[PDB]
């Protein structure tokens, strides 16, 4: 087996969660859905209703 | 001759003629670690640096 799995990228914004010991383990791309952009705007991973 | 400077938050390798001193912990004193100037209390915590 010999594959490439190459994917291009575009300049976008990201919200990086920093857990204990300095690891990320979680991120939110604020360019795919309005929900992700809302999560990035308020700096939270759980959004309330409204 | 263009002398380009680069830090990239990397461990500094080229320093100046300044002489190093002794580490004074648990006391509000001035610090110049890698050029970072300021004043604080050098105290160790349980952080895990990569």
């Amino acid at each position: 087996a010999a594959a490439y799995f190459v994917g291009y990228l575009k300049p976008t914004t990201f919200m990086l969660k920093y857990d204990e010991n300095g690891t990320i383990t979680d991120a939110v791309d604020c360019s795919q859905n309005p929900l992700a952009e809302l999560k990035c705007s308020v700096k939270s991973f759980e959004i309330d209703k409204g | 001759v263009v002398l380009s400077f680069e830090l990239l938050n990397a461990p500094a390798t080229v320093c100046g003629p300044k002489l190093s001193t002794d580490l004074i912990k648990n006391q509000c004193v001035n610090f110049n670690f890698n050029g970072l100037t300021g004043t604080g209390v050098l105290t160790p915590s349980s952080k895990r640096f990569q």
């Binding site: 990228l9 990201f14 990086l16 | 990239l8 990569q50």
Partner: peptide, 18 residues
């Protein structure tokens, strides 16, 4: 065939707490 939350690198060398 889809990069599902893949390719997340550290932007800099600065350590950050929670």
């Amino acid at each position: 065939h889809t990069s599902s939350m893949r390719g997340v690198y550290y932007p800099d060398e600065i350590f950050r707490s929670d």
